[PDB]
Design an enzyme around this catalytic site. Sequence first.
Site, PDB file in Angstrom:
ATOM      1  N   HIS A   1      -3.732   7.205  -4.364  1.00  0.00           N
ATOM      2  CA  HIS A   1      -4.130   6.369  -5.741  1.00  0.00           C
ATOM      3  C   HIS A   1      -5.564   5.943  -5.550  1.00  0.00           C
ATOM      4  CE1 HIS A   1       0.536   5.640  -6.027  1.00  0.00           C
ATOM      5  NE2 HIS A   1       0.266   6.685  -6.477  1.00  0.00           N
TER       6      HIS A   1
ATOM      7  N   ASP B   1      -1.769  11.592  -9.139  1.00  0.00           N
ATOM      8  CA  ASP B   1      -1.503  12.218  -7.822  1.00  0.00           C
ATOM      9  C   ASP B   1      -2.345  13.492  -7.452  1.00  0.00           C
ATOM     10  OD1 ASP B   1      -0.015  10.049  -6.895  1.00  0.00           O
ATOM     11  OD2 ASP B   1       2.006  11.085  -7.112  1.00  0.00           O
TER      12      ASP B   1
ATOM     13  N   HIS C   1       2.773  15.953  -3.367  1.00  0.00           N
ATOM     14  CA  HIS C   1       1.873  15.864  -2.155  1.00  0.00           C
ATOM     15  C   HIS C   1       1.476  17.396  -1.231  1.00  0.00           C
ATOM     16  CE1 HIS C   1       0.846  12.185  -3.778  1.00  0.00           C
ATOM     17  NE2 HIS C   1       2.059  11.668  -3.424  1.00  0.00           N
TER      18      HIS C   1
HETATM   19  C1  MYR Z   1      14.094  -1.194  -5.975  1.00  0.00           C
HETATM   20  C2  MYR Z   1      13.953  -1.000  -4.519  1.00  0.00           C
HETATM   21  C3  MYR Z   1      13.984   0.610  -4.402  1.00  0.00           C
HETATM   22  C4  MYR Z   1      12.711   1.297  -3.844  1.00  0.00           C
HETATM   23  C5  MYR Z   1      12.395   2.106  -2.905  1.00  0.00           C
HETATM   24  C6  MYR Z   1      11.828   3.319  -2.835  1.00  0.00           C
HETATM   25  C7  MYR Z   1      10.545   3.163  -2.367  1.00  0.00           C
HETATM   26  C8  MYR Z   1       9.628   4.023  -3.267  1.00  0.00           C
HETATM   27  C9  MYR Z   1       9.118   5.422  -2.590  1.00  0.00           C
HETATM   28  C10 MYR Z   1       8.195   5.864  -3.530  1.00  0.00           C
HETATM   29  C11 MYR Z   1       8.418   7.352  -3.673  1.00  0.00           C
HETATM   30  C12 MYR Z   1       7.372   8.433  -3.032  1.00  0.00           C
HETATM   31  C13 MYR Z   1       6.318   8.884  -4.068  1.00  0.00           C
HETATM   32  C14 MYR Z   1       5.218   9.971  -3.493  1.00  0.00           C
HETATM   33  O1  MYR Z   1       4.502   9.388  -2.747  1.00  0.00           O
HETATM   34  O2  MYR Z   1       5.327  10.940  -3.728  1.00  0.00           O
HETATM   35 ZN    ZN Z   2       2.380   9.498  -3.596  1.00  0.00          ZN
HETATM   36 ZN    ZN Z   3       1.300   8.474  -6.688  1.00  0.00          ZN
END
Ligand code: MYR
Ligand code: ZN
Ligand code: ZN
Length: 267
Positions: A73, A229, A252
């Site tokens: 980001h 991204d 990614h």
């Molecule tokens: C409401 C709490 C639940 C959140 C837990 C999930 C954590 C978010 C992970 C982000 C997903 C990865 C995105 C990415 O970088 O490709």
């Molecule tokens: Zn990401």
């Molecule tokens: Zn992202």
Amino acid sequence: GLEKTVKEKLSFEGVGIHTGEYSKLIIHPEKEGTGIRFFKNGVYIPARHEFVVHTNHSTDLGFKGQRIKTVEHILSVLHLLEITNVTIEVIGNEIPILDGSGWEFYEAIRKNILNQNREIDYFVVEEPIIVEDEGRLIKAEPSDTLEVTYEGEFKNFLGRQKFTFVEGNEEEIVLARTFAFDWEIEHIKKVGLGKGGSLKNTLVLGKDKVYNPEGLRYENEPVRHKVFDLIGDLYLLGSPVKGKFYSFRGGHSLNVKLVKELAKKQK
Ligand SMILES: CCCCCCCCCCCCCC(=O)O
Ligand SMILES: [Zn+2]
Ligand SMILES: [Zn+2]
Ligand SMILES: O=c1ccn([C@@H]2O[C@H](COP(=O)(O)OP(=O)(O)O)[C@@H](O)[C@H]2O)c(=O)[nH]1
Ligand SMILES: [Cl-]
Ligand SMILES: [Zn+2]
Ligand SMILES: [Zn+2]
């Protein structure tokens, strides 16, 4: 365009989405020809593809024993504003996630741009290329401008849809937030990630539902975020990029794979 840096030191801080730890960011001005680099515990880590160590649920960089999680980001914002010379000092192990978008970085940096004394040396895509992985596809081709299209095909209500960034439309993508599916949460937690995730920094979506009470800022917010991204990962080519890109279901890992193939072909 001319090389750019920041007019002064800019600070950002908060929880990291994966580590659940508080970290702090100091963006330092640098002179012509420095490039973009991170700095951590006495180690400079260039924002280049050679330094990628993990791509599963974020883009992570590392060098000489020092690692930084979730650089996509901040790098996307720097790419969009053509900031070419800065040091990003990290006190911590991850870039702060903030609201899950690029907005706070974008607004602060946009107000503090300093044009410098060199014409940018762009990474210019010279010929068409296609990289693939089990359903997922990205293609790149020559263009005078940066143009980025993401097509998603999701197994929930989002279905199949498409968004295109062109130069001059930066404001259309910097507000789009990171997202996760409810059925993916168990896996992410189980591999030791997502520890700082909440509804304040992540859009959580189910098969039929949006858990965030604010809902979606745009009907295609997740697809706009995927474009955002990809622009971050593209900056790992080491310079701002000129090319037309189409991504079908990319993430990614595939972004970094395309960057590596473009680099060795040598544009
Ligand atoms: C409401 C709490 C639940 C959140 C837990 C999930 C954590 C978010 C992970 C982000 C997903 C990865 C995105 C990415 O970088 O490709
Ligand atoms: Zn990401
Ligand atoms: Zn992202
Ligand atoms: O258009 C898409 C569809 C999926 N994904 C992500 O890529 C992974 C691929 O999931 P898939 O539908 O292929 O089933 P899975 O491989 O998880 O069993 C999922 O976790 C999604 O988060 C994506 O980035 N864009
Ligand atoms: Cl994993
Ligand atoms: Zn110029
Ligand atoms: Zn995983």
